[PDB]
Amino acid sequence: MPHAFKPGDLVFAKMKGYPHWPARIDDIADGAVKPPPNKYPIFFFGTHETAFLGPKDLFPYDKSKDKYGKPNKRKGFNEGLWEIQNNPHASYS
Numbered sequence: 001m002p003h004a005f006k007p008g009d010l011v012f013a014k015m016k017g018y019p020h021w022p023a024r025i026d027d028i029a030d031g032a033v034k035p036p037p038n039k040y041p042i043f044f045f046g047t048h049e050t051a052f053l054g055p056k057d058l059f060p061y062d063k064s065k066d067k068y069g070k071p072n073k074r075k076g077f078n079e080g081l082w083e084i085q086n087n088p089h090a091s092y093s
């Protein structure tokens with residue numbers, strides 16, 4: 001049974017103008033800006049950028065990897081695929 005997203009969960013995250021992108025739910029550091037209601041800090045693998053997104057844009061990784069895991073030409077995407085498959089919980093900062 002699924003649960004609400006928690007830090008460490010692996011997803012594909014969708015933003016307008018980009019393919020569904022390999023990403024993880026991040027933690028919020030002490031005193032850092034918190035997401036709006038029902039949004040989460042999304043760390044994008046490959047590009048190593050963070051956005052606040054809601055669950056409607058978050059696709060759990062295992063269920064969605066067959067559909068969204070194909071390499072493409074977008075900058076950072078293939079490295080993102082490598083990171084989520086090979087070391088998704090490492091420090092990339």
Ligand SMILES: OCc1cccc(NCc2cncc(Br)c2)c1
Pocket residue numbers: 013014015018019021044047048049050051
């Ligand atoms: O719209 C706010 C916002 C926040 C972070 C990054 C971007 N664009 C670039 C980008 C980088 N990695 C994955 C994707 Br998917 C997109 C936009």
